[PDB]
Enzyme design. Sequence first.
Site, short mmCIF file in Angstrom:
data_model
loop_
_atom_site.label_atom_id
_atom_site.label_comp_id
_atom_site.label_asym_id
_atom_site.label_seq_id
_atom_site.Cartn_x
_atom_site.Cartn_y
_atom_site.Cartn_z
N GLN A 265 12.97 -16.70 -9.48
CA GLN A 265 14.13 -16.19 -8.02
C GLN A 265 14.21 -17.65 -7.65
O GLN A 265 15.42 -17.87 -6.93
CB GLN A 265 13.09 -15.51 -7.61
CG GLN A 265 13.22 -15.24 -5.72
CD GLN A 265 13.16 -14.54 -4.75
OE1 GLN A 265 11.99 -14.81 -5.09
NE2 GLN A 265 13.70 -13.78 -4.15
N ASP B 270 17.69 -18.59 -9.36
CA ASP B 270 18.54 -18.14 -8.81
C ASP B 270 18.95 -19.20 -7.39
O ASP B 270 19.94 -19.58 -6.94
CB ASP B 270 18.26 -16.81 -8.61
CG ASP B 270 19.32 -15.82 -7.76
OD1 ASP B 270 19.53 -15.93 -6.58
OD2 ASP B 270 19.77 -15.34 -8.90
N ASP C 241 18.19 -21.80 -6.22
CA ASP C 241 19.15 -23.21 -7.00
C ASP C 241 21.13 -23.22 -6.72
O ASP C 241 21.43 -23.82 -6.42
CB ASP C 241 18.48 -23.86 -8.25
CG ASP C 241 18.34 -25.75 -7.96
OD1 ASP C 241 19.65 -25.86 -7.89
OD2 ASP C 241 17.66 -26.14 -8.19
N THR D 139 24.66 -25.54 -3.94
CA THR D 139 25.40 -26.00 -4.65
C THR D 139 25.34 -25.78 -5.87
O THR D 139 24.73 -25.12 -7.00
CB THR D 139 25.14 -28.05 -5.01
OG1 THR D 139 23.25 -27.38 -5.90
CG2 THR D 139 25.07 -28.58 -3.80
N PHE E 159 24.88 -27.51 -9.20
CA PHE E 159 23.89 -27.83 -10.30
C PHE E 159 22.34 -27.61 -10.06
O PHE E 159 22.53 -27.14 -8.79
CB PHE E 159 24.62 -29.12 -9.96
CG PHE E 159 25.99 -28.76 -10.31
CD1 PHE E 159 26.53 -29.06 -11.04
CD2 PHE E 159 26.33 -29.82 -8.99
CE1 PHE E 159 27.78 -29.97 -11.46
CE2 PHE E 159 28.37 -30.15 -9.11
CZ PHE E 159 28.33 -29.97 -10.48
N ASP F 264 20.07 -28.42 -9.40
CA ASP F 264 19.63 -30.32 -8.95
C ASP F 264 18.70 -30.42 -7.97
O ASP F 264 18.25 -30.48 -7.47
CB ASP F 264 20.77 -30.44 -7.85
CG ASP F 264 21.46 -29.33 -7.38
OD1 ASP F 264 21.04 -28.21 -6.77
OD2 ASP F 264 22.84 -30.15 -6.98
N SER G 23 18.46 -28.42 -4.24
CA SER G 23 19.02 -28.28 -3.50
C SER G 23 18.25 -27.23 -3.06
O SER G 23 18.44 -27.18 -1.55
CB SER G 23 20.51 -28.01 -3.70
OG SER G 23 20.37 -26.37 -4.89
N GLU H 121 11.48 -15.55 2.60
CA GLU H 121 11.99 -13.89 2.04
C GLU H 121 10.83 -13.71 2.14
O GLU H 121 10.51 -11.83 2.58
CB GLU H 121 12.98 -14.18 1.03
CG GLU H 121 13.46 -13.33 0.17
CD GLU H 121 14.59 -13.64 0.04
OE1 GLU H 121 16.08 -14.22 0.07
OE2 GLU H 121 14.61 -13.24 -1.78
N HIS I 241 15.15 -8.67 -10.78
CA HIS I 241 14.78 -7.56 -9.30
C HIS I 241 13.64 -6.15 -9.58
O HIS I 241 13.46 -5.63 -9.20
CB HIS I 241 15.68 -6.92 -8.59
CG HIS I 241 16.14 -7.57 -8.00
ND1 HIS I 241 17.41 -7.65 -7.55
CD2 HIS I 241 16.33 -8.54 -7.32
CE1 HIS I 241 17.50 -8.25 -6.06
NE2 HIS I 241 17.06 -9.28 -6.80
C1 HEM Z 1 20.47 -13.66 -8.35
C2 HEM Z 1 20.19 -13.33 -6.79
C3 HEM Z 1 20.33 -12.56 -5.92
C4 HEM Z 1 21.72 -12.96 -4.96
C5 HEM Z 1 21.80 -14.08 -5.14
C6 HEM Z 1 23.09 -14.62 -4.10
O1 HEM Z 1 23.54 -14.36 -3.06
O2 HEM Z 1 24.61 -15.18 -4.99
C7 HEM Z 1 19.47 -12.16 -5.03
C8 HEM Z 1 19.34 -11.84 -4.04
C9 HEM Z 1 18.36 -10.51 -3.18
C10 HEM Z 1 18.89 -10.45 -1.84
C11 HEM Z 1 20.14 -10.55 -0.93
C12 HEM Z 1 20.61 -8.83 -1.34
C13 HEM Z 1 22.12 -8.89 -0.39
O3 HEM Z 1 22.24 -8.57 0.58
O4 HEM Z 1 23.10 -8.30 -1.56
C14 HEM Z 1 17.37 -9.90 -0.76
C15 HEM Z 1 17.30 -9.97 0.28
C16 HEM Z 1 16.65 -10.33 -2.31
C17 HEM Z 1 15.58 -10.10 -2.21
C18 HEM Z 1 14.45 -10.29 -3.41
N1 HEM Z 1 14.31 -11.16 -4.52
FE1 HEM Z 1 16.54 -11.21 -4.92
N2 HEM Z 1 18.44 -12.11 -5.89
C19 HEM Z 1 18.77 -12.62 -6.93
C20 HEM Z 1 17.86 -13.19 -7.69
C21 HEM Z 1 16.07 -12.58 -8.30
C22 HEM Z 1 15.13 -12.43 -9.38
C23 HEM Z 1 15.61 -13.21 -10.75
C24 HEM Z 1 15.06 -13.28 -11.08
C25 HEM Z 1 14.06 -12.16 -8.38
C26 HEM Z 1 12.71 -12.19 -9.41
C27 HEM Z 1 14.48 -11.62 -6.93
C28 HEM Z 1 12.98 -11.49 -6.03
C29 HEM Z 1 13.06 -10.91 -5.29
C30 HEM Z 1 12.32 -10.44 -4.83
C31 HEM Z 1 10.98 -10.98 -4.28
C32 HEM Z 1 10.05 -10.07 -3.78
C33 HEM Z 1 12.92 -10.24 -2.80
C34 HEM Z 1 11.48 -9.69 -1.64
N3 HEM Z 1 15.46 -11.35 -7.17
N4 HEM Z 1 17.70 -10.68 -3.57
CA LIG Z 2 21.93 -26.05 -7.02
#
Ligand code: HEM
Ligand SMILES: [Ca+2]
Length: 595
Positions: free
Chosen positions: A105, A108, A110, A184, A186, A188, A190, A258, A351
């Site tokens: 997470q 992701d 970053d 960003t 990268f 990095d 951020s 979150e 997820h």
């Molecule tokens: C990658 C990744 C995303 C998308 C990132 C992007 O915006 O480009 C992501 C998204 C979300 C969202 C937004 C959903 C939407 O409106 O479309 C929520 C609410 C959310 C919540 C949680 N996530 Fe997540 N998620 C991404 C990756 C990961 C990873 C990767 C290994 C994990 C682990 C993880 C976990 C969780 C989490 C755990 C308690 C919640 C709550 N997410 N995600």
């Molecule tokens: Ca970054």
Amino acid sequence: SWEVGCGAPVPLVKCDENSPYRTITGDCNNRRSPALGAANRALARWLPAEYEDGLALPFGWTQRKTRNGFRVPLAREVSNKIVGYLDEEGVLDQNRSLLFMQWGQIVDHDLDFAPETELGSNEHSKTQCEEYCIQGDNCFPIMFPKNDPKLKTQGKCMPFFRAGFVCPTPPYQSLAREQINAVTSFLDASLVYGSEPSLASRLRNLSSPLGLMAVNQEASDHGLAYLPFNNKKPSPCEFINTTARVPCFLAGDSRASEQILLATAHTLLLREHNRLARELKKLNPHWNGEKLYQEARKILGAFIQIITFRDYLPIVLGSEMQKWIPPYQGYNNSVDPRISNVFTFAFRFGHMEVPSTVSRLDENYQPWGPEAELPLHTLFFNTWRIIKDGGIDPLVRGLLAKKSKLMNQKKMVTSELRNKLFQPTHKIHGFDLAAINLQRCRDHGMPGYNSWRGFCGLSQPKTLKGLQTVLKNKILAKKLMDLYKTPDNIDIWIGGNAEPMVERGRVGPLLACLLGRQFQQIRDGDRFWWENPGVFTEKQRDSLQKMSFSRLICDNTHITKVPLHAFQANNYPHDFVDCSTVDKLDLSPWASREN
Ligand code: HEM
Ligand SMILES: [Ca+2]
Ligand SMILES: *[C@@H]1O[C@H](CO)[C@@H](O[C@@H]2O[C@H](CO)[C@@H](O)[C@H](O)[C@H]2NC(C)=O)[C@H](O)[C@H]1NC(C)=O
Ligand SMILES: *[C@@H]1O[C@H](CO)[C@@H](O)[C@H](O)[C@H]1NC(C)=O
Ligand SMILES: *[C@@H]1O[C@H](CO)[C@@H](O)[C@H](O)[C@H]1NC(C)=O
Ligand SMILES: *[C@@H]1O[C@H](CO)[C@@H](O)[C@H](O)[C@H]1NC(C)=O
């Protein structure tokens, strides 16, 4: 004649090309395309966008309008029939710690953030989207199918607003709709420092000569720092317990609060910064705050890069690692380092790794107190459980000693996320992250499962027997065929995560291809990659490569018992040692004599 030149948005660069430090925005990384990888630019497209009207409308928007001849099934119906499960017993990954899930997470966050269309504020038509379940403009509600238990308690839909897009705020039109990446591209840090100069400044302690990040002034964790609170309201962390009245944290990334484990991780990174800076002052009393800030930032960025590529990626991609990510051969400025729109859905494999509970553990790694084990749903947007209930150490122990959920074809996403997700705005632990993901694929104009198999050089099943073979699973293939009718229509989030995992990894071939390609590009197209000679010295790189997550914890918590291999599953006490057996970051190589 590239219709390149929409839109104005962010001021389009200002470079010291020769500075040894990254910008905050990501501008000036690539010398010939100085906006490449910068925040607030369109996500890259690796394949052309697929929209109902060819331009911006998502598939599913118009009821009679089919994708490849078939109705797109409801995102909530796919979530209920394929993604869900009741029994939480036997779901855990025997060889991945809960830190494996959490680091993913962090990574992701970053790399990518496509925020929702902000228009709904200063207006109730936004509150009307939810109240009346009405489709229009950026309102694209997730409708409940018949037989959905949420019909009895929650109404007819879950509101959903479309992602923001460049030429950004007016609806239409020119080339296909391109969603924005607000951070960003990268790797990095951020998420610690911010991706915009406003926030980067606010995060810093400008009062101090030590180049520190701002810390909480209202609370401490046995004398160690918390992140500062956001003083602006209503931050939703206040709403979830109006007695404790603890706001969300302010961090480089707005998603930091979150969930509580993410905030935990953010806190360890912030402490590490301040540690590095102080230590660097002791070694170099002559450095000013700016110098100190920037040098610590640079090390923490290395940290994030090294843990990700050395410890995390090999155990995601397993035997496919070497195939997509060969040994580093130096910086190549012909490589596109931008995060692709598809990656933002491939990386949501995470997820399927999130368990239904989180534990607090004491110093013997035993349940801490009478409320030791907590359901994940009570943790969304929850800071009070840190500040009023033990600080971060009992949670960090759980990260080390508990396990990630294993992705399972019959138990995909826990109900804590699939039925109880909390979204800040209209009162209820009642949303579905899986349904959201599926709807979001469509929102983003994602090509379907077979287009991505084609892109990766993989076979494209057209029949039930074909899908059974690729999925290695007869029941799951039949359930997907009943909903989608052709594998061509399977949304990429669900098709990529449905595939059996590769040996020593935790994703299938399709995801291994899409993830591996993206991570190669972000290493190769980054001028400030930690291994690029001249960004650090040889002696600094020798020192940086002794770093581990165990050491991060030892240095910035009151935990002294840690495993050597933080990401694998570790049973206490047999796999644990104490912090005096774990290598330290030797900062000698940053001693500079300006004689
Ligand atoms: C990658 C990744 C995303 C998308 C990132 C992007 O915006 O480009 C992501 C998204 C979300 C969202 C937004 C959903 C939407 O409106 O479309 C929520 C609410 C959310 C919540 C949680 N996530 Fe997540 N998620 C991404 C990756 C990961 C990873 C990767 C290994 C994990 C682990 C993880 C976990 C969780 C989490 C755990 C308690 C919640 C709550 N997410 N995600
Ligand atoms: Ca970054
Ligand atoms: C809301 O937060 C409060 C404040 O932490 C929680 O109450 C604390 O928990 C235990 C016993 O309730 C005590 O050790 C603290 O002193 C309590 N403080 C107060 C003011 O009661 C409370 O449990 C939370 N409630 C919910 C529903 O989340
Ligand atoms: C756990 O995974 C690692 C790869 O991280 C591997 O080297 C190790 O052998 C695995 N443990 C078991 C018991 O399979
Ligand atoms: C900034 O650092 C100074 C001096 O080191 C300290 O007294 C102060 O609390 C810090 N302020 C913040 C907001 O972190
Ligand atoms: C740099 O990358 C581009 C695109 O991938 C490629 O054409 C070129 O050969 C690469 N350079 C090296 C040294 O591999």
